[PDB]
Write a protein that binds this ligand. Structure first.
Ligand SMILES: Nc1ncnc2c1ncn2[C@@H]1O[C@H](C[C@@H](N)CC[C@H](N)C(=O)O)[C@@H](O)[C@H]1O
Ligand SMILES: Cc1cc(C)c(S(=O)(=O)O)c(C)c1
Ligand SMILES: [Cl-]
Ligand SMILES: [Cl-]
Length: 235
């Protein structure tokens, strides 16, 4: 079937089954988002001077979370940098296929990399929280009414002074419907900064330290993508 057809179906079964539709999609092989590798802006950020700084300052027990990790390319990448890394996905099928795709990873073998079937909204945040979290094609997978809970979870998941990286894609403008929902930095901002009763005036919970157009985007991502680095505050 075509990509449009696979997306049309995906949106059907989400309409009928809700969040259970994802493991169905994985079981049936309707995974049109799967690229087989990380997106280049992630590696370029990490190898950039800002990224080297972030990695060099990592504590000896620094922990990474990649929610909605799918086949887990991003989690495998962060583990290969020496971070103890958990890739979390709602679909047990996705998590099994991530264990297959990464079966030869030295970090999987050692346990430094770990894949687990987990609901991002429900699992128990560890006491130490996470030093670094990476969100790619997860915020844009969620229905719009789940964006505020996503930001609330994000605020609990990242330790004070820790970092959240959002590869914001797809920035398609006013197109309606999803997945993949058309998003932008403002939508990520509003979700992450939440509200303070009276208003949502930013600088409450995060500092947006970096917001760039990546220089190396996949060709179908050019013009629809921004990379954003957030630091958690209110220590
Ligand atoms: N509440 C949830 N908790 C954890 N994972 C979820 C949740 N809802 C949806 N997902 C997963 O989010 C993934 C969205 C995928 N389209 C993208 C996967 C991955 N980020 C990639 O770049 O390949 C799916 O694998 C879902 O199983
Ligand atoms: C969650 C989600 C779903 C889909 C179908 C896609 S994609 O087809 O555009 O690649 C992406 C990027 C994310
Ligand atoms: Cl990769
Ligand atoms: Cl934007």
């Amino acid at each position: 079937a075509t990509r449009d057809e696979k997306i049309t179906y995906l949106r059907k079964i989400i309409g009928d089954k809700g969040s259970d539709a994802w493991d169905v999609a994985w079981q049936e092989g309707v995974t049109p988002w799967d690229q087989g590798k990380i997106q280049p802006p992630l590696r370029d950020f990490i190898e950039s001077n800002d990224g080297k700084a972030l990695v060099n300052k990592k504590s000896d027990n620094a922990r990474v979370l990649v929610p909605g990790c799918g086949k887990g390319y991003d989690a495998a990448y962060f583990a290969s940098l020496g971070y103890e890394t958990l890739g979390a996905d709602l679909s047990s099928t996705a998590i099994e296929k991530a264990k297959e795709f990464w079966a030869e990873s030295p970090e999987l073998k050692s346990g430094k990399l770990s894949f687990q079937t987990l609901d991002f909204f429900k699992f128990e945040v560890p006491e130490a929280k996470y030093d670094l979290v990476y969100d790619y094609t997860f915020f844009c997978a969620l229905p719009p009414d789940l964006r505020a809970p996503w930001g609330a979870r994000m605020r609990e998941l990242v330790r004070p002074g820790g970092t959240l990286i959002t590869l914001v894609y797809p920035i398609d403008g006013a197109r309606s419907g999803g997945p993949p929902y058309s998003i932008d930095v403002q939508k990520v901002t509003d979700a992450l900064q939440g509200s303070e009763e009276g208003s949502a005036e930013p600088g409450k919970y995060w500092t947006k330290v970096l917001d760039i157009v990546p220089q190396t985007s996949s060709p179908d991502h050019v013009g629809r993508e921004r990379l954003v680095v957030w630091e958690r505050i209110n220590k």
